[PDB]
Amino acid sequence: DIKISVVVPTYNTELEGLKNLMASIDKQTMNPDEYELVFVDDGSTTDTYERLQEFAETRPNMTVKQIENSGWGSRPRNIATKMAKGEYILYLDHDDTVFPETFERVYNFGKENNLDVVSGKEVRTNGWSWGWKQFSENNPHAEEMGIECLLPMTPHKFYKREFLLENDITFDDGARVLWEDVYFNSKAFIHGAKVGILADYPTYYWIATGANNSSSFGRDPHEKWNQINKLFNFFKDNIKEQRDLDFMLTHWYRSRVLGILGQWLLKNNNERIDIEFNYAKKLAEELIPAYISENLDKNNQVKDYLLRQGDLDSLKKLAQIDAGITALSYVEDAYFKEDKLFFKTSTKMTYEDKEDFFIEKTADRMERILPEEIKSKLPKEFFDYSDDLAEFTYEPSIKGRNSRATWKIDGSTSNVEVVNKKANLYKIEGEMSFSVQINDYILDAADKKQPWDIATRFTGLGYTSHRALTIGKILIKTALINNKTMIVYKNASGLISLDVGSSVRSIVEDSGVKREQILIDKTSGKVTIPLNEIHVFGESLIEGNAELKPVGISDADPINVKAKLIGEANKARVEVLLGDEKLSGEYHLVTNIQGKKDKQQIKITL
Amino acid sequence: ISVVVPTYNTGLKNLMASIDKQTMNPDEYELVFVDDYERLQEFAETRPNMTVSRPRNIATKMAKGEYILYLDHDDTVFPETFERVYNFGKENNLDVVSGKEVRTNGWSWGWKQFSENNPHAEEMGIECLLPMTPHKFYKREFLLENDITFDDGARVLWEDVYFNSKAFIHGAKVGILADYPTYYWIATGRDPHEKWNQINKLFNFFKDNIKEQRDLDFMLTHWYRSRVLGILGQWLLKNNNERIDIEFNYAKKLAEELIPAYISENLDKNNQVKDYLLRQGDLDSLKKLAQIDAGITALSYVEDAYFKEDKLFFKTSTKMTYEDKEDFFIEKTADRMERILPEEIKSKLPKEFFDYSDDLAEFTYEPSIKGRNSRATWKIDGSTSNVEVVNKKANLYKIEGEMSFSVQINDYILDAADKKQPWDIATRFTGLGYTSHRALTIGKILIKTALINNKTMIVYKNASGLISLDVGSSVRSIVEDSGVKREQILIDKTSGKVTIPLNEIHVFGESLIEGNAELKPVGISDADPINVKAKLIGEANKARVEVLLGDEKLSGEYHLVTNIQGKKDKQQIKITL
């Protein structure tokens, strides 16, 4: 009967903070009697549980319960899981929202493929990607790729309820644990769960809400490595498939242990460094097998080797040398063609978007430029980039400013070259061409009117640069394509944006008007205002209005009339319908297409 | 010397506390006040040399000094200027002298004129008085004999241009004193109709009072480009259409009525385009041109930086870009180098106005410095640069430049406070009518120390990504940034020489900077912190710190925190004595 159960823990949660959440559930296309809401309050000390209980009385599919306070959301999640009746369970946190077609699409995907876990595409407020690797294409048999299919391991997936009960998969109830959701998803996979990835529709919006946690638990350096030790022991004791154990070992050794040996060494005091360095050296010796480092890139093998040697001074010097390496992309050309937007971009590896990043060519080896002092202490292959010069990636991406959803722009062609600038020094240059088909990223009705931000992702030599596309010159190009206003522009921050639906810019203002080509039809009451610079493809009819005020009347009253933006035969124009309005004299015309007024100083004599 | 002081809602104690710090004999300079206050009388009775537009013209005859200056509110005057300006004007018999002026912001002030001293600077023309600030030194004889006077009456813009031009028109002898920084201007016409009524009054003053044709065409060219054509560039992108239409029609009316046609012959290509379209009334083309010209600059990166002998050396590279991003390009059509423009604008213009062919050899590329405490700017002499026009793709050409220069910090030290202050490096690139004077930047971390003739110098990439040079530990600790080879620490328990050598540093000459240290017990959170004497030595291409414990009374392992010139270290020096 019930397809989905929504599990939402609360604690001193005001009803106003649930307004956006409850609104996103009401907007679900799935019938309300086919899902249920299970709120479990963690023993609120204030009077917020009373207001929530009264709120649920008007909603039959919503049940609320309070337990004794546990100081954590794991026990509320478990209590609600055993209360739930639905076939699938979504763990929805009260600060987050869901997209309107999530329940319909996810359940159909899971039921038609008999999935135990549907890892749906998740969206975050910040960043240019989330789940870039896994949220690529739909995969009903995702567990065949190994335990990696569940990354990123947030709890915001849809888990089959009976599968959790049969395997007794719960959240840790006792002491608080870091990366608790990693334990939960890993336990689900090692019990043979069928995993499906739904990547073609954003399902969950994980919202950043000024996380000034102010918790000594999350800042205690000894607690941190106590939690890291038990996380790795959990891997080694429970994950028995060699392929999946080795992946989790390398992934978390790279991110959490090796991740303090880079920029982190430049923004921490010396005593904090000594404490966490000795913790990391001991953990690598005790829990990280030596073969794991063979799966790491060159720069991480150097960090691994120097860590096990206890050479903190060399790692500090290397952190200073690597600081600032990036790859910013510049727009070399941008234009509309037919029904798409085209880009030509260029990039190169630099230090802070300044001087070039170099690599030396000694003998037949492309080597990392390092001091002779540090270089004479490392294995010679670890600073040899020769085998890695053919594995650069250069791709475009897009991000909706309202939905915060992120997509890879397919169909691009790129090329990365290793060029000799001078002597034996080599830079890394990249070129790319791609087109944007905005229909590929419009899924919900609200997506049709949205500013879009364009980014570039450049990887190579172990570095990853996912940054916004930028330009120096002023760029303003307009287009009217199949009932969609489109403008590519250098925004106020100096980055490239695409405003569709006149949510930022007026297309009449940015295109300009053929001033001496305005036609006034007296017998028809139609005023034609042709647009100057604009790319028009297909038929378009966009309705707005126009305000008329007589010239020279300081306090003149607005004469609101109807207007239309018409795209027809590769030409755009605004038709101001005057009808039978009694008018005479000179007037000011101000178009208002899609809630955006122009500043073209249009005057008209009638 | 007589100093004038105009009270305008009068800071008053501050101005007297700065003027009394001069080197010249106090009974050799006079101070004149005008208030036509009850606390003014009390400041005059305390000490002798203090008498108590319209307020400044009465004070001109009221004074009895050979040379007189016009000191404004909140403005500073450097210590040695009084005597240096008097001896320079007397031995050269100057009617007016323009000492080196200093502003808070920017990387230069009077770049062209204030480069070299010239006591016979009136030979070149009226340009020698630029920039025409009221902050020069004037002789009472030439002012009273020629009746040169701030135009009393309603507030007039560029009265400094009136007061400085009227002096030169009446045959004034002026010397440029770029040897030493003198006046410090702290600073701190809004209506569009007031603005252009004043601009009309300025140009009418030129052709009515300036008789020398060379001095007339200069002022006519210099101010038509800055104030009239100056609103046709970025200004068109920062104002509303109403303001633009009112101001553009004023600018068009002044060009037609006052500015002759032959003035455009002395302008560069881009300004000739602005003059042509202005007289045509084509505001649409100028607005489009402002969008195309926006963001054009040239940023310089550090290719290499090192100490050699007793100088700091740099090797920089630059390239004309749009806002430090993609490259600025010029087109090669037929045999001429054209600027990239649409066909709608290129067809509306004379073909010569967008041809950079005869200008590709006029590029400049020079260095600069600035004392962060003094805000004084200088040009680094003895530099080698080269600009190249390089084909990148198809017929598109970019402007690339490379440059090498060295720095001697004793050249820019003039006051006792100049010995210890941060220094900021900058580059100046000029070409095709554009001028980019930006700070020297670097992306990678740069930290290099040196010990040269008791000067402790460090070149470092600052928090803003720019190049800075700390001299005297005003910002950084040379011990921390040089490193410490703790394995080579020596201990002479007999006399007490606790030797601490430094790792990476460029030592030159002999140096002997003194300081102290602070010792603490190991791990014991708190205890009596007793400080001991310490000393920093630089001998024979090596630097070392020698701690002094002549009265030894410690036992166990101890923390050593050096402290040279008020800058401790983070080297974690644990000593065991």
Ligand SMILES: [Cl-]
């Ligand atoms: Cl924007």
